[PDB]
Write a protein that binds this ligand. Structure first.
Ligand SMILES: Nc1ncnc2c1ncn2[C@@H]1O[C@H](COP(=O)(O)OP(=O)(O)OP(=O)(O)O)[C@@H](O)[C@H]1O
Ligand SMILES: Nc1ncnc2c1ncn2[C@@H]1O[C@H](COP(=O)(O)OP(=O)(O)OP(=O)(O)O)[C@@H](O)[C@H]1O
Lengths: 328, 564, 270, 328, 50
């Protein structure tokens, strides 16, 4: 009995034997973007090191083939001025590819092959530099830094609203930065079965949020309550108190999707509630108060609730007894 | 110019390396690299916002470090006066150290809000670097140096020990918050924010620095200009205000009763540690400030024939710490007074709720004086525990003053101190005399209060029966007795005032005549400083007397008959 | 303004000759203190000895007349105050008594006259000696180093502005302290005067909680007071420390460079 | 009694005691993007200064450890050519990291440790440069410059349309640049209460805009009027004239969300109307006229309205009297 | 804080139907650059009272 999604958005499911291989040479960029910072740093640094050393070996080899390390006779001019050790060729490669070019060690017309090497190293340097910079960009424009500030109470409560027994939960945003088109997809998951008999382990039913329009967008500035009204079409219409417990196959997946204000990109936070975390018969205490010329969202006691009794039977039996009391 | 340790070829052959670490210039420069490192790694991640176990120990270390770095800057600038090229390597490292310590302070303050202590361990590596460099400097300073400035040796080892203690603080906070690679953060239960809940007015969330200098109170006053304050526009209590105080007082009275199985005993047993804490502040303060005249003597005699500058600015730093400690001493005591006021009002009110009516109907107590005691007794005890620490503080001060006179210019035949030595009997005598008078003054005040109360209660009766000349002159008699007693009181307090301000000139005269430059006036300066406490002692003893009699009246009231 | 007028009526209760004697006493007293010790400065580089002693004697006798004048004027003012107020009050008609609440008009004899007649002289002499020693030492440190005045001038402006700032804070504060302190005495009068009823209703815990709240309120008000007072204390102290430093530095530089009888240097710095 | 959202989109609500801390080391980028220009400028400048000075101290220290400042004997060759003062090492660090490299002061093979320092400073320079450039990019691609041009009249009017009493307001776009998928979410907010009794301070009901399709997208070229038809399901169906006033707990939050034309990113403008700003019984005067071969949107008198009477009772009592007059 | 911002009749009081100098600068108010623009259309199109 695992959690489908962790209380912090971790999709707690392993793949175990994908058939095929990955992307030929594009998975490099995607797998590169989302990755721990020091590892990415190290990869780029070591790319620069290998690019420098490779052409360093190249220049050194060229100077040595030109017969330029031994003679120093004064007459024959080098392919590249004043290099006498592999250290020299390495300094030269760094000067070239980093576009520093001090000048004490300089390419000469005496070796057109050396000119080819220069062109090659410049092209490679620009290509690798642009790749590194595009990667560093799309990494520094990363999302899900905000997706951690989007908080959700550890518990969800049900209560009576409009004479109806509706499942609720409070949502929370901690950043003053605003999410755009914030959309809710509450989704109950369990191992359910069709009448014909087929059962699927993680079945998924999009349970609709009760919105005056009916849509799924919200406008979260002050941390509010998301809630579903349990209708005879809702799968939770057979739910009862004391049926919920950490050993009851039941879970409602909560999805929050919107656009970051500063970065036009989209992020998603996930939270889940299995049966026990769904507290029966409570109400989230209002954590907002009219401050002095302001609205005071007391973020303390954020998910703190209050217990309230209720008819301790299914919304099914709710409508049963209600019809029996109304047709009386 | 502006060379690190640069002089002509004689010293231009100094930066040479006949052994790298043997070059003092080299280790001197290496001791700058860490401070540079921190000062430039932390500014950006500080300007991003600007644009916790082991608080007390860390801060004690940091301020001791501050003081000794000031000392090192002084030593450097002094020892640069012998050369003529202004080789600035003597002090520049210490200036970077000053700045780096300040930055460490401000940085950790702004990180303590949201500590990502993996971001805080930058301090770990940094202090390790600084410690390593200073240990290297010290070790190589054992040999290879004339050590003609033994102060250089002491300060070097001193900084080594301070960096080591800082590192130990760092491993302490690490272990407590084991995060670095360990799994258990032992994370938090901070009442400073949590228990506050959003309605509070006090020091705890503020740092020790402001807890000494009232920066938060500066902010609090900041709005009082732009907007008139209101009672809703007011902070709430601390979670330990006047309820835990009352419970502690009841529990300490229970402990004192078990000991028994006056009320001063219970009060002290409940309360004395905070008082001796405020006192300790006062003692450390005035003892430090007592090194004031020494600076004056040094000034004058160093001028007699440049270290007087650094000595004067040393006195400056001394007075800075001096009065920032006087503030601590005073505020702890005024806070004490507030707590005792609340607790005693609570206890008195409980006694009221247990008061027997017959006691109020038939005899001793009238509502007037029963409320007058909490009205005035409490204020007087509050003021007494304002002047509380000074009492235990002055004798320690006066003894050190005498000892210094014996070790300072008045080394022998300073006899004029015997004047103040004989003054303490004069003080205690004026005390007991004021005490003899105070009972009569207080009883006559109470009589007149009973008079006027009773009078203006049925003042219509008086307007009708034309007995107001009669009752008014009757009250005038009481007021005349009160006037006479207060007249003796005023005579005696004027005697105390004159004796107070008169004994210093007596002392200076007797000392300076005892002889038959710096010495005379330095002693006179000490005499100013020593007469400073006496001027306040004048009222200290008065408040002492009044508090004694007031607690007498308190115990008088507490022993009353109770409904049960 | 208002303080000038209130203190002027206070001293007006005293004889004008008391104003003369007090002012001459303070001034001559501490100007002789300055004279004797700044002239001891002339001693550090006998005749001067004997007249030095007679200056000491003048200081002591003038201190005595000073303190005596202080006590006697405080007492005379208190006497005139109590008598005149008692007379004018008892002589007021019934419209006042039936209109005005008794507790108020009573408190001015109860605690206000108490405050006056046994705390005014203390505070007045404290203020008098403090401000006069102050202004004297100011003038003297200006004199011993005529350079110091230029540093002194902005510092006084800073002092003036931040102290007016603190006072505009502390007036509202002290008003709040008064208005938070009154309900204490009110609830106490209620507690005692209606104690039998409260015991009957058996609601003692309720009024106990109410008083706990009242006391907490007074306590928080007083802590406001103290925080403000200590903040100003700190600021003014740091002003004073800056003063000390400036004087010392200026005097040392001048003297050792431009000789000036360094006894005067020690004098200014002390 | 504060405004939930200012008449200019400011979410006038403070958080006051968030429990946790921020993002470990990612909040740096987000908090960096949206931030006042001079502060960001200064941060980057000072980053470059500290990066230059740190390696400046490094190079200077290396030259001094090599015993290269004192001798000038001519024989021993420096780690780096021709540096004699910390000023020299600082100029050298600037030349290196900015990739200038004049040449008068140049790295030599005589110190491999100096070569390591060179590699380190080049890597750090490229990393810091890419970070600064990614930040400057995502800042110069900032939104909400357009979100200020999206204007909204200071008042909203109600009137009769289709024999129905519908709440209206005019929308305005001032830029010729077009917003894509411009979507409206009118949302009434007040301190309302369920029948069971629970009250929430800032309750939020998505009041649906009357759209011929029913959706919430618009096509704003000429500044038009947004309006809600007040039905028995609308919470405003109990509203009456003279019930609106600046001391009536009432406010309707208006949200505009779309994609900027030039920058594919999304922006959101907010405006709000509490009870008094909701003018009762008026109509926004048509600010458009058929220009000479053109459509003339007279942007002047933009929100200027005209007063019109109306049945001064609730839409509830409207339907009451209407049913009484129709079933007669 | 106070911009004392504006009440410009040049644009506002004009309301969109005007023909004169005020919105034009003193320079054109001496040299008729706006009138140059006004005549500019009179070539490409015959003027009308509307
Ligand atoms: N285990 C798997 N992991 C990843 N991809 C798979 C896997 N099985 C099939 N696919 C992909 O899905 C596509 C269609 O799936 P299909 O149902 O044909 O699988 P299949 O060829 O029948 O293999 P299998 O019998 O294992 O399902 C194929 O192109 C294949 O690449
Ligand atoms: N005041 C708050 N500010 C920010 N985040 C919070 C706050 N309170 C709780 N959270 C976060 O929300 C998540 C679930 O909240 P939960 O309802 O468990 O709060 P809690 O642990 O009960 O604390 P509290 O009792 O203060 O609500 C937790 O992971 C927690 O980090």
């Amino acid at each position: 009995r695992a959690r489908f999604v962790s209380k912090k958005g971790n999709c707690n499911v392993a793949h175990k034997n994908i058939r095929e291989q990955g992307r030929f040479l594009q998975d490099v960029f995607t797998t590169l973007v989302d990755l721990k910072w020091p590892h990415t740093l190290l990869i780029f640094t070591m790319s620069f090191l290998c690019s420098w050393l490779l052409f360093a070996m190249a220049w050194w080899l060229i100077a040595f083939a030109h017969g330029d390390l031994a003679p120093s006779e004064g007459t024959a001019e080098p392919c590249v001025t004043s290099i006498h050790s592999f250290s020299s060729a390495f300094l030269f490669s760094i000067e070239v590819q980093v576009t520093i070019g001090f000048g004490g060690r300089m390419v000469t017309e005496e070796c057109p092959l050396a000119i080819l090497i220069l062109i090659v190293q410049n092209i490679v340097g620009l290509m690798i530099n642009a790749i590194m910079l595009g990667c560093i960009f799309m990494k520094t424009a990363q999302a899900h830094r905000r997706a951690e500030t989007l908080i959700f109470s550890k518990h969800a409560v049900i209560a009576l609203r409009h004479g109806r027994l509706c499942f609720m939960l409070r949502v929370g945003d901690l950043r003053k930065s605003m999410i755009i088109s914030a959309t809710i997809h509450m989704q109950v998951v369990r191992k359910t079965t069709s009448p014909e008999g087929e059962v699927v382990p993680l079945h998924q039913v999009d349970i609709p949020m009760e919105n005056g329009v009916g849509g799924n967008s919200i406008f979260l500035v002050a941390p509010l309550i998301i809630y579903h009204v349990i209708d005879a079409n809702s799968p939770l219409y057979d739910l009862a108190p004391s049926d919920l417990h950490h050993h009851q196959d039941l879970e409602i997946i909560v999805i929050l999707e919107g656009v970051v204000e500063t970065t036009g990109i989209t992020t998603q936070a996930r939270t889940s509630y299995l049966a026990d975390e769904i507290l029966w018969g409570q109400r989230f205490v209002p954590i907002v108060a009219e401050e002095d010329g302001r609205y005071s969202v007391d973020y303390s006691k954020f998910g703190n609730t209050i217990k309230v009794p209720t008819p301790l039977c299914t919304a099914r039996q709710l409508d049963e007894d209600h019809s029996l009391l109304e047709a009386l | 110019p502006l060379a690190f340790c640069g002089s002509e070829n004689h010293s231009a052959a100094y930066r040479v390396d006949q052994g790298v670490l043997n070059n003092g210039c080299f280790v001197d420069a290496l001791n700058v690299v860490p401070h540079v490192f921190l000062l430039f790694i932390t500014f950006p991640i500080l300007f991003i916002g600007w644009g916790f176990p082991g608080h007390n120990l860390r801060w004690i270390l940091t301020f001791m470090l501050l003081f000794v770095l000031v000392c090192e800057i002084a030593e450097g600038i002094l020892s640069d006066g012998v050369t003529e090229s202004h080789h600035l390597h003597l002090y520049m490292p210490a200036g970077m150290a000053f700045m780096a310590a300040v930055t460490s302070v401000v940085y950790y303050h702004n990180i303590e809000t949201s500590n990502f202590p993996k971001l805080l361990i930058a301090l770990l590596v940094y202090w390790t670097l600084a410690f390593i460099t200073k240990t290297i400097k010290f070790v190589k300073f054992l040999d290879h140096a004339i050590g003609f400035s033994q102060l250089r040796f002491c300060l070097t080892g001193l900084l080594v020990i301070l960096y080591g203690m800082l590192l130990l603080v760092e491993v302490n906070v690490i272990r407590v918050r084991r995060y670095i690679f360990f799994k258990t953060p032992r994370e938090v239960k901070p009442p400073e924010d949590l228990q506050d809940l959003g309605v509070r007015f006090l020091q705890p969330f503020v740092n020790l620095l402001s807890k000494g200098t009232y920066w938060w109170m500066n902010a609090f006053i900041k709005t009082a200009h732009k907007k008139p304050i209101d009672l809703r526009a007011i902070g709430k209590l601390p979670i330990a205000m006047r309820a835990l105080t009352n419970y502690q007082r009841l529990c300490e009275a229970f402990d004192a009763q078990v000991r028994k199985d006056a009320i001063w005993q219970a009060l002290s047993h409940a309360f004395g540690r905070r008082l001796v804490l405020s006192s300790t502040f006062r003692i450390l303060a005035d003892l430090l400030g007592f090194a004031g005249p020494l600076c004056i003597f040094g000034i004058v005699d160093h001028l007699g024939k440049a270290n007087a500058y650094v000595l004067a600015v040393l006195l400056f730093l001394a007075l800075l710490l001096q009065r920032t400690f006087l503030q601590a001493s005073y505020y702890v005591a005024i806070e004490t007074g507030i707590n005792l006021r609340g607790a005693i009002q609570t206890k008195i009110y409980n006694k009221i709720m247990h008061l027997s009516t017959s006691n109020l109907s038939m005899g001793e107590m009238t509502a007037g004086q029963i409320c007058n005691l909490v009205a005035i007794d409490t204020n007087q005890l509050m003021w007494f525990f304002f002047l509380c620490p000074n009492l235990w503080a002055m004798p320690v001060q006066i003894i050190v003053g005498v000892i210094l006179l014996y070790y300072i210019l008045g080394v022998s035949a300073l006899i004029g101190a015997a004047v103040i030595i004989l003054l303490a009997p004069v003080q205690y005598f004026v005390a007991t005399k004021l005490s003899q008078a105070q009972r009569s003054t207080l009883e006559y005040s109470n009589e007149r209060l009973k008079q006027t109360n009773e009078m203006l209660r049925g003042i219509k009766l008086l307007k009708l029966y034309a007995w107001e000349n009669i009752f008014r002159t009757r009250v005038e008699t009481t007021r005349r007795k009160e006037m006479t007693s207060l007249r003796a009181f005023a005579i005696y307090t004027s005697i105390s005032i004159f004796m107070n301000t008169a004994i210093p000139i007596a002392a200076v005269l007797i000392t300076f005549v005892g002889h038959v430059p710096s010495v005379a006036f330095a002693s006179l300066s000490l005499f100013h400083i020593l007469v400073t406490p006496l001027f306040l002692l004048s009222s200290v003893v008065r408040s002492t007397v009044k508090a004694l009699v007031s607690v007498q009246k308190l115990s008088e009231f507490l022993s009353s008959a109770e409904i049960r | 303004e208002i303080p000038w007028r209130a203190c002027a009526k206070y001293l007006s209760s005293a004889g004008i000759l008391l104003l003369s004697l007090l002012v001459f006493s303070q001034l001559l007293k501490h100007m002789v203190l300055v004279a004797i010790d700044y002239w001891l400065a002339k001693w550090t580089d006998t005749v001067y000895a004997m007249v030095f002693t007679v200056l000491c004697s003048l200081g002591i006798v003038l201190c005595l007349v000073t303190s005596v004048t202080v006590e006697w004027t405080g007492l005379k003012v208190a006497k005139r105050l109590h008598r005149s107020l008692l007379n004018r009050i008892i002589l007021a008609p019934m419209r006042f008594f039936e209109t005005t609440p008794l507790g108020s008009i009573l408190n001015r004899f109860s605690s206000d006259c108490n405050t006056i007649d046994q705390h005014i002289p203390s505070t007045l002499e404290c203020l008098s000696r403090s401000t006069l020693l102050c202004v004297s030492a100011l003038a003297v440190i200006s004199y011993v180093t005529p350079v110091f005045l230029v540093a002194l001038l902005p510092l006084a402006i800073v002092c003036y502005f931040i102290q007016k700032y603190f006072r505009v804070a502390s007036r509202d504060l002290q008003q709040l302290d008064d208005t938070t302190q009154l309900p204490l005495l009110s609830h106490f009068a209620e507690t005692v005067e209606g104690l039998t009823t409260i015991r009957a209703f058996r609601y003692e815990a309720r009024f106990q909680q109410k008083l706990l709240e009242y006391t907490d309120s007074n306590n928080i008000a007083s802590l406001f007071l103290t925080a403000a007072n200590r903040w100003l204390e700190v600021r003014m102290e740091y002003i004073g420390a800056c003063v000390v430093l400036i004087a010392a530095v200026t005097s040392i530089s001048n003297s050792l460079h431009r000789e000036l009888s360094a006894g005067l240097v020690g004098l200014g710095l002390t």
